[model samples]
Target: GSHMASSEDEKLSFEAVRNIHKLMDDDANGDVDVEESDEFLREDLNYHDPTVKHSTFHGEDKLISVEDLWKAWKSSEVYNWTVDEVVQWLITYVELPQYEETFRKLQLSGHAMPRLAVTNTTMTGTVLKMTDRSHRQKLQLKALDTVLFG
Candidate 1:
């Protein structure tokens, strides 16, 4: 079952529209706001017309920058995907897909549960250790390696 749009009016820039769709698809039980405005229409910066009748203010034909991609990625509904989900998506669809299978294993493991332990060390230090960017990057790389090796 699907609700199909009648025509081009239903479509917009691939990134913006796809991001919204991904968000809706991921949240099967969530409610979405359906407000509309100029900003809403242009957030993706799409002209939607092949004739260029309604171009962006800057008249840009394409979003041609990694920074723009990053913006789309950050704003995408998929941004909320679990680390494992992200890994899966990256591998299956991204140009340079990384870890997939190994991330799934970690997600399936019971390590995600929260368990409190009493400690005398500063809480900030422990938090920093757990949330360190480099540590997270290393873990992701390890998962990537495992997936690639499989």
Candidate 2:
């Protein structure tokens, strides 16, 4: 919620939220309570849930590979297109009812889905230069960090 930040100084940007969503939704697993894997950790940690046994099962919570998203973005017809152009393209090409239904299902199930609305908002914000350098840097670093290790 917006309540997480009282003022602009502490407010988290939409891009941050969207990136976090992407980081947390790898493989589109619908499970909300998925935990992180500890394979890279130097110390040993025990998995209490038999279903999530580190020895036998992979973690449900996974980060979407940034490379994949980058590929999708680059190859998209609307890659270099303006925000309005992208939005129009989405409306023109995507079946609205099906898109909405699928999106709602994923969202309600605590799974991450594509962010048409947030993408539009981000595009609009970028077009309008409604962001600060600090926030932009943070987003870039976060994306790069997640892509590298997530």
Candidate 3:
């Protein structure tokens, strides 16, 4: 749903979020409908249902663009994410169910997000790999922006 933009907060630049919105908002109706989300997210239908105010996805109908998606995201600095946090993002938003444990074992975090999914990270001999092309790129597209904070 639509959360008020310019009403609060900015971890990422407005233009970046604007660009993010453009990609996520398929029809460009200035909102993200369940129609746009149904194919992308794995969620209880009620969560996105506007009538169910008590449910989890209750910010509004158009989610990403209006700042609800950013608001829905936990407030912790992306720099300080826990393993479960990273895991949560992969499933709840990033849509990378291809390998769960592997990401967890990597202890992926927002701090390492920029370099998180390379073929293999160089320093400390960290190994990283994601098989799906769209999935990998999709996550990179989202993760990098979230971590683009200064």
Candidate 4:
């Protein structure tokens, strides 16, 4: 009745509203009161925390769940980001520490310099042209380029 009129005016299709209700009503008991909403908010939905040691989205010891993401999406005012964008960002965020460690090891081992020079002609030229620069400056420049564009 009124639901249909408001839903139409709000530009939310009936199916979409139904789905939203479905997600909001965590217990699926056909009632969605403030208590239910409060409980849903309070639920431990296993949200991903970057600072947590074992916080991962997928895999055996998964910490984050879809419900957690849904809650975050609705609560965080992140309407600008599509779900795909958020997921991609999360993937990168979760994997960054590992990538950083690997990158640091490669840098320390002096293995990345030769490979970077071979792959990046502009960097190689800059490095060569900056012969008057100190070795530390050259290294900083190369590292800056790698970090910026790697």
Candidate 5:
């Protein structure tokens, strides 16, 4: 039970990181600049009414990267959170009802259906090579095993 819970927590943490990347990447440049980072923090502060100071800037007015943002978060009063917890907090406090609803739906319905053959494949020199029927069954069974043991 504990192991299953931890795996779910880790998945949520990864999702949170992805969401953070999406939110911070305002210029569509695959990274967050100082201006964009500050804007996100300002908007978060204005909308969320956090007790702690809500600023992503660490000191200098230089470009702020994702690593910098994580470091700043680590030093703040909300430092005790994992990335998943932080994301959950953001989703709730920022009033992202759509995202919350979507996550809940995914949780409830993300599993592969029973008795369906989900093909397993591998890449061979830029080509997808399909595996045997037994291999596909193994993949499906693996998911079921996780669910059962989980």
Candidate 6:
């Protein structure tokens, strides 16, 4: 049951490990990769002991993985996003550069998707009017659909 060292009263928890795996496991498959981990775990979630081991995600063989629950800007996809990802989403996926800055300045997260998805939402010029449908709908698929949202 307890797979830890030193028997500390304050150490990592199972929930923390679960979050770690979820982070590296992008694409929502089952496993993780060096590329995925690299893209994701730029640092360590191993809060305390460097030797602290794991059984479920003991994935240190250079593969087999993966939040920021914001300074980290990580795990911004599961339910919503961190600001960087939301920014990346708009600039990369939506192609609404003209209105991109408008959103970029707001520091909005992925949680704002639904708020923008609907029409007449105090959200533009050509990009504004247009994103209401095209870009927003595109986000609908890429975000909700792509991220396998419920």
Every candidate's lDDT: 0.28, 0.31, 0.44, 0.31, 0.34, 0.40
RMSD of each: 16.7, 14.4, 9.8, 20.4, 16.8, 14.6
Backbone steric clashes in candidate 4, count = 0
lDDT of 1 by residue, 12-115 (tens): 23332333322222322121122221232223212232122112211443122222333444454443456665455544532223243334333421111100
What is the TM-score of each predicted model, taking all chains together?
0.22, 0.26, 0.38, 0.23, 0.31, 0.36
Q: Largest lDDT belongs to which candidate?
A: 3
Best by TM-score: 3
TM-score of 5: 0.31
Worst window of 10 by summed lDDT in candidate 4 = 44-53
Model 2 weakest 10-residue run by lDDT? 38-47
Name the regions of candidate 4 deviating beyond 4 angstroms.
Answer: 1-17, 26-31, 44-77, 82-84, 92-150
Tell me how candidate 4 scores on lDDT. 0.31
> Which lDDT tens digits does candidate 6 get at residues 105-149?
454455444334323232332235443556544544333322322
Between candidates 3 and 5, which one is better according to TM-score? 3
Candidate 5 — number of clashing residue pairs? 0
lDDT of model number 2: 0.31
Backbone clashes for every candidate come to 0, 0, 2, 0, 0, 8
Predicted candidate 4 versus true structure: per-residue lDDT over 88-116, tens digit per residue: 43235322223333333332212232122
Residue pairs with colliding backbones in model 6 are: 20-66, 21-66, 22-66, 23-66, 24-66, 31-65, 32-65, 76-81
Q: Residues 13-33, candidate 5, lDDT per residue (tens digit)?
A: 333332333343455343456
Candidate 1: regions farther than 4 A off: 1-60, 87-101, 104-150
